[PDB]
Amino acid sequence: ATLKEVEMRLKSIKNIEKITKTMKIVASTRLSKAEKAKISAKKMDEAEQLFYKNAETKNKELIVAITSDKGLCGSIHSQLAKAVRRHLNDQPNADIVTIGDKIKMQLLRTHPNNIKLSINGIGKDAPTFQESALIADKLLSVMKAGTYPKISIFYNDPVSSLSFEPSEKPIFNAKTIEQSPSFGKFEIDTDANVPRDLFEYTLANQMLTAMAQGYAAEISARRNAMDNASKNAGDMINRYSILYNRTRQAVITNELVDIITGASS
Amino acid sequence: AAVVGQEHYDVASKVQETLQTYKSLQDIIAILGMDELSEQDKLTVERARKIQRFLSQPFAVAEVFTGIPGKLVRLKDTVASFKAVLEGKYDNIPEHAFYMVGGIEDVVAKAEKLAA
Amino acid sequence: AAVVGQEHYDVASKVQETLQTYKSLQDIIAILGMDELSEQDKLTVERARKIQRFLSQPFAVAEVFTGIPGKLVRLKDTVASFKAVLEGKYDNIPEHAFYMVGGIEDVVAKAEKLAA
Amino acid sequence: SEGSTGTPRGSGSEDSFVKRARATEDFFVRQREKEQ
Amino acid sequence: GEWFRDNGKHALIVYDDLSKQAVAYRQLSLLLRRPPGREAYPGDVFYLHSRLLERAAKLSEKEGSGSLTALPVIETQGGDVSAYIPTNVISITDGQIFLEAELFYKGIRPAINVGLSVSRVGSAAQVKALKQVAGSLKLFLAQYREVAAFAQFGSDLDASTKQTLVRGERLTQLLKQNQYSPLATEEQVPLIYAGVNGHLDGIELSRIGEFESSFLSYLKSNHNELLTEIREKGELSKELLASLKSATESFVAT
Amino acid sequence: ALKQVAGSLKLFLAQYREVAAFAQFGSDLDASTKQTLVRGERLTQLLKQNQYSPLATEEQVPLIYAGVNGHLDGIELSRIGEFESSFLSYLKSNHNELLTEIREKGELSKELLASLKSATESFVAT
Amino acid sequence: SAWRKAGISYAAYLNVAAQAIRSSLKTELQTASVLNRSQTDAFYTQYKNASEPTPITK
Amino acid sequence: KLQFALPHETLYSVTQVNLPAKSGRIGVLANHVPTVEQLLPGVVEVMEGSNSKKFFISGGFATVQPDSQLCVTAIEAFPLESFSQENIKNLLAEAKKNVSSSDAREAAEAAIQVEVLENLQSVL
């Protein structure tokens, strides 16, 4: 509680306030940019899955959980992790592919043996088809994504531009695309591979739609947290300013009292 | 340990360790939020907040200030009650149930009341 | 520059700029982590960290504390060795090589010794 | 002002913010030195 | 220094420094058993310095028009400008130039904090030619200091923000100056003209040093007549503004 | 003898204190770090000591040797207490000449250093 | 082609194409965003039991 | 009534379009039979009445809906005026070299590039 302690503490929090405020304004920019890419991925979801609306598709399981590697975004990772565990109560033997070290973090504590594949380095830049396709590829290659009755993608959905809700959406394999009730209403060449190719194509597009949404939900949550951290730091600065001044006054008085006592004698 | 027994001594040390861990994190909590702790650290903070509350107690001479009947908890029951809380046996119980009661039976009691 | 020569002065000045810039980054690292650092930023961090270590030196009289025998490094060695690091010639050499050694030669020798 | 949050001053003057700056950073250097 | 002021001449006085003078006054009074005040300085320690600095003055025509100018020096302790004696002197003087170790280590030399330094007299006694280019050098820099924290996020920058940073970084590197190398007014104006209006924005930062040397000797060899009109007139013609642009743009080609 | 067995111990608790910050960082990497990460926590428990219970050098030297060379890395944290008092029962029961050596000579020859090593690796298996 | 014999999946094929088409653009129209559509620092790591074998890329 | 969408941009959401299917390169009229088939990397043309616009795509999936709607999804899609001849060549050559480049699908990926870059030059 010395003057120099309060000074150090004060200058440290003063930087924190500045840094966090800056990050927040940065995130706001990142969100404008990621908003437009979310709309585009939502149009390639109305047009992409409109086949599945009409064809009216219905279904050991594969779960793919989508967050990122980055912290400082509130409960993005823990909230989605709870949604996955909740689904994991209803089926505890399912395989998990985690996209993002932070979700891997959560599910590695609670359900360590279920995780069979982790994806790294996704969160920094806006998600791309290349990333989705290559992940899908390795899903199909080493995870045998074709041989699964049910497939689910867990991601965060930006309900509004302020908050988010952990959503879920299922993926149906080539085996399931054929057995859809209204499947035959479209002229389809059974000679060539249309079911397999449509399953492998949707796997990549849906993941890209999840990541585009989960990314806009993470920026928004980080802009929320950075607004808070900055506001809290401001209050801390005010409390420590007040403390500084009390200590300042005391030090002047105390130093002077010593002098007075020495002069009196 | 020579005076209170190894059990008592060890419960105290763990309570103290838990409270210490929680204090140490007050910086982060206040600035960044609870979301920025590890999961091991979230649990400790949860547990410590319940220990903080469980250390509170209604005094008989305070009945006017509180409107809450005084409690006098036996040492042996204080040790057992805190031991059990450290061991994790009451992590499903909400915070307020530890606040301003006696022994662990009162925690369970209040929790059921709060469930109603 | 008039006293130690324009080369010496320039080396010193940019070591000092590197170490100052480092401090400013350590702030961003505290709050935001690594993800908001440019590729040059991360290089600055790496080099400054080597520079800091490279400034350490085993003293002859500190032998009882270090265990390590003391080194004496000529001024010309010092300027040359630090210039080389400021330019980039050892960006592939790990930190530990720069710590508690003499001139630039003793760095490479230690770097190869830790490879084995 | 520069380094007031991040840089390590004496032990017994430590933030948790100083403590994490050195933690997130030491890890980073470890990973890069491991790769090289 | 007053002999000059009184006899229609002009003097400059540097008190280096007033901190140590205060300490010496303190030593006297304590030892004379005069009552001590805050930090053991005498009661009248403000009056030690105010009495002194008020003697610096610009005289009227009637009294000979002489001047005495004072550059008192104060050493602060930990950067604490709110410290006792510094605070006395800050309130006495007409403004302050504030220097920071941080700036010094960064490469900014003279290590002057532009935000915390002022002259309350200001423009009134600046060379008109410098005042014409400096007016908005204040602006572009105040704007730069506001937005400086965004340089850490280069990848995320918008148009006018990136533009502000580029100009700022350059105007800062422009104000760097080796010791014992004071420049003439006519040498200062064009350097500032080149920065303020934009002629530096295309040049990489590390090259601003060698730009200054080469741009100056070029002007003394080709457009010395412009430098001369600046020096002699002190103002800037609409013609001279145009001739200067012409001279600048020409050099930008290399 | 104590200087020998505790070669790095002090900077080894600066190597461990370093990795103590890595755990609340949340990251689960550096398995090589895991080796030192676990060791330090056991070294810390080894250095704990009840009051009014000082140990002779011949009792200390083995304990420090056991901890530093990672012979403890595979024992449970909560049993390091009992490990100590048993290990010293074992050395008094059987290797009684080993302790007498350290006591009288105040040093460890290359012969003793391996004799102790062998007696250590021996006791690990209960 | 015959990406069938090789390990190539349908979307991986389309990406290979899409890449070539992006690289094929008039260099000035290869904007910042276009080049971002082309690079990733993503890794993949297989897990068993909670250990794992070797980190890979892409 | 066309929805022409890419992951990064949605071009349309008109009278007739021509699209390069896996099957015969097909043209699409006002009341086409509900059809769903692949799209190879080729040229998608669209005439809005009289004036037509030309987009070279990467390939995706064509979808004809019951209610006279056409949904075309592709990863990349660009006008022809947007390509530089030499970049295509520099790639083409490097791709050809990479066929039989060594063991792996590195060899097989190149084969895919050559065909696509050839289909590109063939149009101009």
Author numbering:
A (entry chain Q): 1 to 59, 71 to 276
B (entry chain P), C (entry chain N): 360 to 475
D (entry chain T): 1 to 36
E (entry chain K): 256 to 509
F (entry chain M): 384 to 509
G (entry chain S): 1 to 49, 53 to 61
H (entry chain R): 11 to 23, 27 to 137
Paper text:
The models of both assemblies in the asymmetric unit contain the same residues and have the same nucleotide occupancy. Residues 17–35 of the α-helix are bound into a deep groove between the C-terminal domains of the αDP- and βDP-subunits. Residues 1–5 of the inhibitor are in the aqueous chamber surrounding the γ-subunit in the central region of the F1-domain. Residues 6–16 form a loop region held together by a salt bridge between residues R9 and D15 of the inhibitor, and by a hydrogen-bonding network involving residues S4, R9 and D15 of the inhibitor. However, the other interactions noted in the bovine complex are not conserved, but the structure indicates that there are additional significant interactions that are specific to the yeast complex. They are a salt bridge between residue E2 of the inhibitor with residue K361 in α-helix H of the αE-subunit, and between R32 of the inhibitor and E398 and E405 in the βDP-subunit, and an electrostatic interaction between inhibitor residue D15 and R9 in the γ-subunit. In the bovine structure, there is no nucleotide bound to this subunit, whereas in the yeast complex, the still partially formed nucleotide binding site of the βE-subunit is occupied by ADP, but without an accompanying bound magnesium ion, despite the presence of 13 mM magnesium sulphate during formation and crystallization of the inhibited complex. However, the amino acid side chains that are involved in coordinating a magnesium ion indirectly by binding ligand water molecules (βE189, βE193 and βD256) have moved away from the positions that provide the coordinating environment (as found in the βDP- and βTP-subunits), and the magnesium ion has been released from the βE-subunit. Thus, the present structure indicates that the magnesium ion is released before ADP, and that the inhibitor has arrested the catalytic cycle of ATP hydrolysis immediately preceding the release of the nucleotide.
